[PDB]
């Protein structure tokens, strides 16, 4: 076939019922994740090719960066709750991996402040039980699917993208192959 199991994707032994249609996992500490967001714009190019009616979910993971890694999963929960994902993603990535100015929960908070989220609004979100269940959701979805590495994408809890098996000689070609694969898995 042109799309083969074990080649552009793998299949989960243990399929996850009730899973989001397209489920991406990342960490702000994750170097290929920085590339996927900043240089490749994977998430966005996948959207542009996905069928009608399909929702995209993106979650942060705890297993990188220890205490800060966990802080970042909670901050990402704040981001989802307030709908400000598109305003903090870039400065969080650069603050962790480029400038290395993120070292504490207080520094993560600064990024939201500078992006124009109000202090009171951030701290109230941060401490809210809506955010705690959102953190719970991120952890459960990761737990449901075996996850020990990022970036990772899962389609309907059955198929996992396998970027190792796509040519990286061209960045644009890589992205299209990636997105077309998601769409193929989507229609499966």
**Cα–Cα distance, 174 to 112 (Å, whole number):** 32
Domains and CATH numbers, the chain: 1-188 (3.40.30.10)
Our measurement of the distance from residue 48's CA atom to the centroid of its chain's CA atoms, rounded to an integer in Å, reads: 17
* Burial degree of 171 (CB within 10 A; 0-12, 13-18, 19+): exposed
User: In the numeric block, which tokens belong to residue 95?
Assistant: 């603050």
In angstroms, this model's resolution equals 2.1
| Cβ–Cβ under 8 Å, residues 107 and 74 | no
Alpha-carbon gap, residue 88 to 111, rounded angstroms: 7
Q: Which two tokens stand for residue 38?
A: 């900043």
CA angle at residue 180 from 174 to 183, to 5 degrees?
145
Cα(91)–Cα(158) distance, rounded to whole angstroms? 33
Alpha helices in 7-151 (DSSP H): 31-34, 42-49, 66-82, 85-93, 105-114, 119-127, 129-144
**Three-state DSSP state, 133:** helix
Q: Are the C-beta atoms of residues 102 and 68 closer than 8 Å to each other?
A: yes
Q: Residue 33 contacts by C-beta under 8 Å, 6 or more apart in sequence?
A: 26, 27, 93, 150, 151
């Amino acid at each position: 076939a042109q799309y083969e199991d074990g080649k552009q994707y793998t299949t989960l032994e243990k399929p996850v019922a009730g899973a989001p249609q397209v489920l991406e996992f990342f960490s702000f500490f994750c170097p290929h994740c920085y590339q996927f967001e900043e240089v490749l714009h994977i998430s966005d190019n996948v959207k542009k090719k996905l069928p009608e009616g399909v929702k995209m979910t993106k979650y942060h993971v705890n297993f990188m960066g220890g205490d800060l890694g966990k802080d970042l999963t909670q901050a990402w929960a704040v981001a989802m709750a307030l709908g400000v994902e598109d305003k903090v993603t870039v400065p969080l990535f650069e603050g962790v991996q480029k400038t290395q100015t993120i070292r504490s929960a207080s520094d993560i908070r600064d990024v939201f402040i500078n992006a124009g989220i109000k202090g009171e609004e951030y701290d109230a979100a941060w401490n809210s039980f809506v955010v705690k269940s959102l953190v719970a959701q991120q952890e459960k979805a990761a737990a449901d699917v075996q996850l020990r590495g990022v970036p990772a994408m899962f389609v309907n809890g059955k198929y996992q993208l396998n970027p190792q098996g796509m040519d990286t000689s061209n960045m644009d070609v890589f992205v299209q192959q990636y997105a077309d694969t998601v769409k193929y898995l989507s229609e499966k």
